[model samples]
Target chain A: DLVNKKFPAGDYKFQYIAISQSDADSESCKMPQTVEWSKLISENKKVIITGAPAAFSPTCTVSHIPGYINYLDELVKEKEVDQVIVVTVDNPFANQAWAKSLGVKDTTHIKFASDPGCAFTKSIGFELAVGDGVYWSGRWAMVVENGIVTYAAKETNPGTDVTVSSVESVLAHL
Target chain B: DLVNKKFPAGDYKFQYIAISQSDADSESCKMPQTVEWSKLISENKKVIITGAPAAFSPTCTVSHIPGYINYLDELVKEKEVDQVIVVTVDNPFANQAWAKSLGVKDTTHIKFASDPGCAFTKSIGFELAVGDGVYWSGRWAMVVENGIVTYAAKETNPGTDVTVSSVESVLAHL
Candidate 1:
């Protein structure tokens, strides 16, 4: 199970930028991004893993944000996990609505948060890349324990798997 | 006046981002972004200002994305610009439907380009900050000189004035 192993149990935050969905396929335009994960998860004893569509972007209607949304039910169901949230380059309300649309409002148990602008994403080390027209994010994951990530899953390249199953598989060892 | 200024008349490109309509509150979220003016004006010799609801977002929706959709016809008739393009992050099919719905087909000679991402936005510097998100572009207006930006207006705070008039005012000077 994803119980206490190499990764502890608690709430971990993940932050990244939200790119325009249209940009998802373009090679020239990558979303903005960062690779920070220790900051947000380290302090609260909560782990934070950040990902972006392209390097930075809002993943509300699409993948990243929707991933959290689609899996909201599962995360809450897992007793080992306290909270599961997502951060994006989109504004707070954008993320909030997406979460609500995913049924975050109906829930009284789980948590969904958005790091509008990705300040928190950057603080945690996964900030969005600026100036570069080619935006992107590091395909990675993290497990925070007592506010510190005991396990980290940083992808070697872009467009890799950084989903729930991947995290779950790693947590199984812990 | 806003119209009697030295702004060249030609083709101009604009980059648009997506934002959910319900999430637009002017508080937590500001507005969508429209990038791309320098290259279009300078490289492509684009003169007029143009944009869409989003890269692939829908019009009739609020935020900066809708600003273009909501005001293209009047802008073209009153502004006297040569061209105005409405772009979105989505695809041509979505663009076509949006244009048809907004009655933009007969709105002068405006073109709708689908950048998908912010290929044009990041190429320039039309990006912004939303709380802490990255990959988010600042709302802006630009005067491109043969593909180079000679004049520009950026919303430092984000979501101040999302209007075709704002773009028209700049174009009128051309």
Candidate 2:
């Protein structure tokens, strides 16, 4: 029911690997922290969710994710959101490094997670058909209020158009 | 013969896609320029070659590939090398962006190529068995002279030590 469907008002089992700074430090490298979204919404009223193709790609680094970080405080206040989680197709370590570079790794509110297997992207019907024979998640954002998707916005052309899926647009909708 | 061999002086059917700056610009993007080693050695006496785990990972951005770029002129002049090729397991477009960030995309002497399918890394027996079910090329450098591997240096631990496979080490061998 999730495939090609708008965010319905129901609890969806969203599972992702939460990559922490500590996870990136280990020599042997421990597995990333697994997060179950249904458990999180029990306390938090709202969640702002989005994804990027890769961790340090140009658009994602320069504007896309940074826009979310820049407007996080306003978005939180306006949308009544508790968590702003950003996901990527990269591995945990790379995502951790990227978050550190963007100076958002230590932020208490923003969280970076890895969809290494692309399960969540596939389920949402936003997986892009990359020319290199790789599958990356298309740019999409959603607002979840108590396990129900209240607003969903996806870019028509993944990297080119940021208008409809911008933080400004999402904030306007909220 | 090349598959199970180690530094044996013989011809290798080397083929890889050399990522160009133009391909990185397009929104839809195009495939990279493919090159065969046999055609290359006819113009160049020696080829300085190395591989990294990923394009923009920490060490690679900080030291590994940067070392090659820094010492490209010296390595070429002192070692009488025609080409300094750097390869990675990333897609061509990512490799192209990495090259541009490092300010070496337009350098005629050095090249950045993508082994996206890991065909070269696996054939060279340098594929790391990553725990995350992802295969990355182990850190290694080689001096290919007229289609023959005259000097080969591989790091015992991929990311830890660049001593044996560094530009300094490769220059010493020459």
Candidate 3:
């Protein structure tokens, strides 16, 4: 249903955690800045957005996210993808730290974005009871070009695993 | 009001993220186990529980959590502390990953306990609206000895700083 529809530009926003060496070298850490959901789509570029349950990261072998991170080269260089945003219903600090755990020193193309309060995820009908009184975004991915959703699919099994929405699956459709 | 009273034992639980090398050697990632709040108190030992706003961690100098991590040795060796638990409203994976970001290889004496749904934080009357739709634990610290809460205090100036509930502040009272 979301396919052929424009990526829902909501009032929601996310916190970007990718920091450069310049940020580290300044001997100062800026309070994380907010990135609007509307801006990410308004950029007029091809964007691949993936959502995970939470930002509570695990070892490479213990998680499905590595598949996406490992394919950064193919997605960016070969596909000319402008952004690979991994959305989670968690805070930005945790999202960025999760990126660091995976040895992501350069977060230029891929970003672990925080969907605070499930604002963006709910707008797409991907919110569910992840924990007691807490909602989480389903394991899913979408492709948007020029603000239009070209592809969108969610995993069948939900939290137990990530497959249909896996990077390879999305890449196959691409 | 919590001081000089028995450490309130509740049905609340926390997911422990401290995986041993032995656990890693199995090549099998264990689903994080649940640890009861009651069990932590029933251990009948000196315990220090600190509450942070969220597991949204920051660099050592960028945050106050480092203050507690740096003084672990003294807390265990000199004070004979059995456990130093850092409770947050965020999930455990974020908490543990936050621990690793701080270079914590050994989590024997210290733990980042997750209080899902703000269940435990609400019980202690420390829950606060931290984000859009979610709540977080207040910046506070407490000392428990043999099931009795010996000390309890909360920070006057909340999230922006960690002073009255800081490690040194707790150490001074201990």
Candidate 4:
């Protein structure tokens, strides 16, 4: 899903895709996340946002999303990152359900965004759905400076070796 | 856990690791895989053994492993691969339970092997586990030529997106 051409190495600005309330309700009346990636980047410091298939998915739940959700304290406390956003392809409804199930909302650090039909995911070149609009995202993380991609780590599959640790291990470069 | 070394290109082999019958059962048993790597190459063919973490894993079960297992016939029939072996780090007992739950003997042209503790996965430099015996492997597929890895596709995470079809898409190089 590398639909967009690559950007040079530099901090770029980014934000969550805009979601309408009607769009959210169409997908089972889910409570969609409407955080603006552009606004967040403008207000915060350097950031990294990660998107996977869903929240409770084994890899995403166990490591990808949780890595930020679990390590947000470390990231923000240690000044590793200003804010970390973890998102999935699930609609706002499913996204909210999973966040509650994992007790992540109690922390108020990481922002959880939902791409109902992967509109945002496609913009970032993370969308990989073929037919039936069962949209999915390849494992991807982008380090944003201002609003551009300074670093991009994309795995061809869902479960390989990519993790938040892997992202942190390479953070010095960005 | 890298065990401290990067894997170089060569004839890489994986020792199948699986959970044995007894937690206290210290007996070391390695199940046999039907198609040997060397044999595939000898016939002027190649094989791709994709490793996931477990059978019923969130991503592996629903997507990665099943992608190959479900399409075993289509792969062999269309992709020209001699063999395809999909495995996990959960060991033999786990493999048995999973295979039964999966409702397939898992021996129909596709072989399953067991390694007690990733003795084989570690040897090829695919080890990703970092906590005690809890281990993981980079989801990868290697083209074995005369028992040596001539090509490889290692993902950045522990999910599915790279598939047998993707592997075949690269076979024109051979």
Query: Which predicted model would earn the best TM-score?
Result: 3
Better of 1 and 3 by TM-score: 3
Residues A1-113 of candidate 2: C-alpha lDDT, one tens digit per residue: 33233344233333233445454366333335656655655657777778777666667777788888888778777667688878776655456556766766443467777
Per-prediction CA RMSD (Å) = 11.1, 6.5, 2.8, 16.1
Best by DockQ: 3
Residues A1-174 of candidate 1: C-alpha lDDT, one tens digit per residue? 233444332233443234333432453322224333334344343443334433123232344444544555555455345444443443333333344444454423333334433344444454436433322234445555675455554444334344542435434533
- For each candidate in turn, the interface RMSD (Å) is 8.5, 3.8, 2.1, 15.1
**Superposition error at A2 for model 4 (Å):** 10
TM-score of chain B of each: 0.49, 0.79, 0.88, 0.62
- Candidate 4's chain A scores what TM-score? 0.69
The candidate with the higher TM-score, 3 or 4, is 3
| Candidate 2 chain A minimal-lDDT segment of 10 residues | A8-17
Candidate 4 residue runs with Cα over 4 Å from true position: A1-33, A105-107, A163-174, B1-174
- Candidate 2 CAPRI classification by DockQ: incorrect
lDDT of 2: 0.66
Candidate 3 C-alpha lDDT tens digits along A1-174? 899998887778887776565653465354567888789789748899888876754532256688888888898889888888988877777777677666566777888887777778878887767666577788888999889899898766775767767888878866
Q: Which candidate is the best by lDDT?
A: 3
Clashing pairs in 3: none
Error of 2 at B111 (Å): 3.5
